From Swiss-Prot:
Residue numbers carrying N6-acetyllysine: K222
Disruption phenotype: Leads to a decreased pathogenicity in mice and increased susceptibility to killing by macrophages in vitro.
EC number(s) recorded for this UniProt protein: 2.3.1.48
This protein's record includes keyword Transcription: yes
Protein name as annotated: Histone acetyltransferase RTT109
Places the protein is found: Nucleus
Role of this protein: Histone chaperone-dependent acetylase that modifies 'Lys-56' of histone H3 (H3K56ac), to promote genomic stability, DNA repair and transcriptional regulation during mitotic S-phase. Plays an important role in the regulation of white-opaque genotoxin induced-switching.
Positions contributing to acetyl-CoA binding: F132, A136, N151, L152, L153, W161
Gene name per UniProt: RTT109
InterPro entries, per database record: HAT_RTT109-like, Histone_AcTrfase_Rtt109/CBP, Rtt109
Residue ranges occupied by any Rtt109-type HAT domain in the UniProt entry: 1-312
Keyword field contains Transcription: yes
Family of this protein: Belongs to the RTT109 family.
Organism: Candida albicans (strain SC5314 / ATCC MYA-2876)
GO biological process, one term: filamentous growth of a population of unicellular organisms
Length: 312
């Protein structure tokens, strides 16, 4: 998952675990009218880099497997990524985030139970990588924002960073899409002028109803608007085009700092299923860890060190 020059034989350590794969309802509305509906399996990934007793950075990624008879639609959603900044930064953060996210994208050793011993997945996979960029001060690590070595990127800097990282791990993919809701075509294109494989737009179905095209990801700015569409039961009127038009005027975007949406796709990848023993936990155990994490003062070495030792 990480090369030797970053871990340095134990100078740095990793926290990495997955939830046990769990069947959920589709994050994209599928009319019960549809023929050959897929089963959806969700896996949460949590990663953190440790330097001796202290957390350096963290990354949370959710993987959704839409399992059809002959292929899988695989959505990889970056939930959260954050740094602590208690120590002067030794590794460039993208040299860690890039390889970890690439490992998670390509991981195919999930132990999936039968839908009511282990299910075998189709070999043909269509990949979708979904990332939003929004310069929040503390995605994962409370009160880290006033740590002395936390480098807080503004919105445009954060977007340039993510484009660089995502381009590096999606070489040869079929499309790379960028949208900055509320920005003109000219402003959006400047971010991808040096990226020949990137274009303006999004990766989802372009026509029809928005809730049948756009996935509802947790704690996603796009998903927050979709949630409103559904709670007001406008799911039968809202088109894809009008959804992205009105997304630009939401407070989170119009008052935000270069809030952007990235999507990348690779079609018809032949994969081989490949056991790779990693720590797996129940969803309750996963949530317990994340709830403990929210109660840590990441400006306080004592509390951070205590959190790490308790995990060990």
């Amino acid at each position: 998952m990480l090369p030797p020059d970053i871990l340095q034989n134990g100078e740095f350590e990793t926290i990495y675990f997955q939830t046990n794969p769990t069947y959920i309802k589709s994050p994209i509305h599928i009319p019960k009218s549809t023929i050959g509906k897929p089963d959806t399996v969700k896996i949460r990934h949590f990663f953190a880099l440790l330097h001796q007793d202290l957390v350096v950075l963290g990354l949370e990624v959710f993987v959704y497997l839409q399992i059809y008879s002959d292929f899988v639609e695989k959505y990889v959603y970056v939930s959260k990524c954050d740094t602590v900044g208690l120590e002067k930064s030794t590794i460039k953060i993208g040299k860690v985030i890039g390889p970890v996210l690439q490992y998670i994208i390509n991981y195919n050793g999930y132990k999936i139970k039968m839908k009511n011993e282990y299910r075998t997945l189709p070999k043909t996979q269509n990949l979708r990588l979904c990332v939003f960029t929004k310069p929040a001060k503390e995605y994962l690590f409370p009160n880290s924002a006033k740590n002395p070595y936390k480098n807080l990127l503004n919105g445009q800097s954060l977007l340039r960073w993510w484009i660089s990282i995502i381009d590096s791990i999606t070489k040869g993919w079929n499309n790379h899409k960028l949208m900055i809701p509320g920005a003109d075509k000219y402003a959006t294109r400047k971010f991808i002028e040096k990226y020949s494989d990137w274009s303006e737009g999004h990766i989802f179905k372009k026509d029809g109803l928005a809730v049948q095209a756009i996935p509802l990801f947790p704690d996603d700015p796009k998903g927050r608007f979709l949630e409103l569409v559904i709670v007001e039961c406008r799911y039968g009127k809202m088109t894809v085009s009008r959804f992205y038009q009105e997304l630009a005027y939401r407070q989170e975007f119009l008052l935000g700092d270069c809030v952007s949406l990235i999507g990348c796709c690779k079609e018809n990848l032949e994969v081989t299923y490949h056991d790779d023993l990693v720590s797996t936990v129940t969803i309750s155990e996963y949530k317990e860890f994340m709830n403990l994490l929210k109660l840590v003062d990441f400006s306080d070495r004592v509390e951070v060190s205590n959190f790490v030792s308790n995990y060990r």
